Amino acid sequence: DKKQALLEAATQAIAQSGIAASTAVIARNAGVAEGTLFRYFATKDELINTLYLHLKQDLCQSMIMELDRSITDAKMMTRFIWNSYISWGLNHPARHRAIRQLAVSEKLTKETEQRADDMFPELRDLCHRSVLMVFMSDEYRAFGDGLFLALAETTMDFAARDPARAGEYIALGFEAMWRALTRE
Amino acid sequence: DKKQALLEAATQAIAQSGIAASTAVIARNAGVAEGTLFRYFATKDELINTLYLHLKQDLCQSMIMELDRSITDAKMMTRFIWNSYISWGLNHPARHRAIRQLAVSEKLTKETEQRADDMFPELRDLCHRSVLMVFMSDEYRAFGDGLFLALAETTMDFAARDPARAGEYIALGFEAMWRALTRE
Ligand SMILES: CC[n+]1c(-c2ccccc2)c2cc(N)ccc2c2ccc(N)cc21
Ligand SMILES: CC[n+]1c(-c2ccccc2)c2cc(N)ccc2c2ccc(N)cc21
């Protein structure tokens, strides 16, 4: 079973505690010995990187299956992808909380971030077409990403607590994020 | 001293665990019995309301003391007030984390929100003059506030982590927030 068992327990622990979360707690909650966690994942940094790839691949798969390739307007394409992104976060709140904490942790390797980006080429090209050049720079990209993740999580939080207005929060959050991060 | 001790313990606890912070943990960390905490605040909600107003009064005093009335441009003024807001959060990171969790909690009374709203006349009027109608609305103001606090907290987090570019994060964060939340 057990590699999956370790990834799910790391998901919940990091959602709750961020990377400050406990390999003992993780291994325990996965029903295995801690030295066993380290046989599957040689280090904590490798568990963090591997977990991030697994969670991003699930999120990406979920967005890709909803992609209407007929749309070519950058704003309309980005909107329908945001809808999908927020939907996944509403369905998997711990999985999203874990991605956001790992993303901003600066414990992700350059190789990991590029492999994550390559999971959704159309979104990476959308970033290239649409995001302000300052937020695509090496110096401020991480901040751009942090602002995006803040806006997306706040949208998920308001939507999750008031389902009746969820579609409107999702629409208002998209328009706010688009004005915040894109070319004037 | 016991009430102030409970409010400082409550600040630290809610900064770390949100309104899910335990009243057992709060009281112990203040050096008092949970029973005594409920002598000062008969419900968890009354502690939330009182603590919110104490932290907002502190934040508002800090911004009012820094206000430069020589700044007659609405955007530049908003910007100088943003600078003071971020500066207060960098000086008091538990205070700003607690304010954000309390502000989005749905536990604040109508009367609490009204008292908060008229601690800073100049800001209230700038909000009325500048913010998009939808983020003033009874239905979506709370969401607008949540987006603002998410962008402000993210700006503080990046400035605190990478202090060599703090000024740049503060300026970029302001401009992104201004685009996200203000009128044509
Ligand atoms: C900040 C870029 N950005 C954009 C984006 C925003 C505006 C225009 C184009 C792309 C994005 C847009 C949608 N819908 C869904 C996810 C992402 C995304 C996800 C992760 C990340 N690190 C940056 C991301
Ligand atoms: C979202 C409104 N808004 C504005 C604001 C934003 C844009 C234009 C004018 C005012 C604001 C501006 C600065 N500098 C500092 C604090 C706040 C603020 C604080 C709390 C809140 N609940 C809304 C807030």
GROMACS .gro file of C-alpha atoms in nm, chain B residues 8-94:
model
   87
  192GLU     CA    1  -0.195   3.917   2.465
  193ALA     CA    2  -0.220   3.534   2.515
  194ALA     CA    3  -0.535   3.534   2.293
  195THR     CA    4  -0.342   3.735   2.026
  196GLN     CA    5  -0.052   3.482   2.020
  197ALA     CA    6  -0.292   3.178   2.022
  198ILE     CA    7  -0.525   3.303   1.745
  199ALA     CA    8  -0.225   3.414   1.533
  200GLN     CA    9  -0.106   3.047   1.541
  201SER     CA   10  -0.438   2.845   1.531
  202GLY     CA   11  -0.716   3.090   1.419
  203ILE     CA   12  -1.044   3.125   1.617
  204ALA     CA   13  -1.011   2.743   1.674
  205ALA     CA   14  -0.747   2.849   1.938
  206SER     CA   15  -0.830   2.681   2.269
  207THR     CA   16  -0.945   2.892   2.568
  208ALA     CA   17  -0.759   2.636   2.793
  209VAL     CA   18  -0.431   2.717   2.608
  210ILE     CA   19  -0.504   3.093   2.606
  211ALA     CA   20  -0.572   3.111   2.982
  212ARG     CA   21  -0.269   2.897   3.083
  213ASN     CA   22  -0.035   3.104   2.856
  214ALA     CA   23  -0.170   3.423   3.030
  215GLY     CA   24  -0.087   3.268   3.371
  216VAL     CA   25  -0.463   3.223   3.469
  217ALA     CA   26  -0.736   2.953   3.501
  218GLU     CA   27  -0.973   2.886   3.203
  219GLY     CA   28  -1.244   2.948   3.469
  220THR     CA   29  -1.097   3.306   3.522
  221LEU     CA   30  -1.087   3.364   3.141
  222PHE     CA   31  -1.469   3.296   3.139
  223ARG     CA   32  -1.505   3.546   3.433
  224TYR     CA   33  -1.359   3.819   3.205
  225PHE     CA   34  -1.531   3.693   2.882
  226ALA     CA   35  -1.848   3.487   2.944
  227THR     CA   36  -1.819   3.341   2.585
  228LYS     CA   37  -1.541   3.273   2.332
  229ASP     CA   38  -1.733   3.521   2.104
  230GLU     CA   39  -1.702   3.809   2.361
  231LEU     CA   40  -1.321   3.748   2.380
  232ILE     CA   41  -1.309   3.751   1.994
  233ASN     CA   42  -1.505   4.081   1.981
  234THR     CA   43  -1.305   4.257   2.254
  235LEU     CA   44  -0.966   4.138   2.117
  236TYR     CA   45  -1.060   4.252   1.763
  237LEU     CA   46  -1.143   4.607   1.889
  238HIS     CA   47  -0.821   4.626   2.101
  239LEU     CA   48  -0.601   4.518   1.804
  240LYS     CA   49  -0.785   4.747   1.559
  241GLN     CA   50  -0.748   5.045   1.799
  242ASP     CA   51  -0.370   4.971   1.817
  243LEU     CA   52  -0.337   4.945   1.432
  244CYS     CA   53  -0.551   5.258   1.375
  245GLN     CA   54  -0.351   5.463   1.638
  246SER     CA   55  -0.029   5.364   1.456
  247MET     CA   56  -0.164   5.471   1.111
  248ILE     CA   57  -0.319   5.798   1.245
  249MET     CA   58   0.013   5.894   1.419
  250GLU     CA   59   0.197   5.849   1.081
  251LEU     CA   60  -0.063   6.020   0.858
  252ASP     CA   61   0.092   6.300   0.643
  253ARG     CA   62  -0.193   6.549   0.557
  254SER     CA   63   0.043   6.718   0.311
  255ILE     CA   64  -0.040   6.421   0.078
  256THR     CA   65  -0.340   6.554  -0.121
  257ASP     CA   66  -0.341   6.284  -0.402
  258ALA     CA   67  -0.594   6.006  -0.310
  259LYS     CA   68  -0.376   5.720  -0.449
  260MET     CA   69  -0.050   5.851  -0.287
  261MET     CA   70  -0.233   5.889   0.042
  262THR     CA   71  -0.371   5.535   0.022
  263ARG     CA   72  -0.018   5.427  -0.055
  264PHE     CA   73   0.133   5.605   0.251
  265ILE     CA   74  -0.140   5.450   0.470
  266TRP     CA   75  -0.061   5.104   0.314
  267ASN     CA   76   0.307   5.164   0.408
  268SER     CA   77   0.205   5.234   0.773
  269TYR     CA   78  -0.029   4.925   0.774
  270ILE     CA   79   0.245   4.692   0.644
  271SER     CA   80   0.495   4.852   0.883
  272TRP     CA   81   0.258   4.777   1.182
  273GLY     CA   82   0.225   4.414   1.067
  274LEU     CA   83   0.604   4.372   1.032
  275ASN     CA   84   0.643   4.523   1.380
  276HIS     CA   85   0.358   4.304   1.522
  277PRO     CA   86   0.319   3.988   1.313
  278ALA     CA   87   0.103   3.801   1.572
   0.00000   0.00000   0.00000
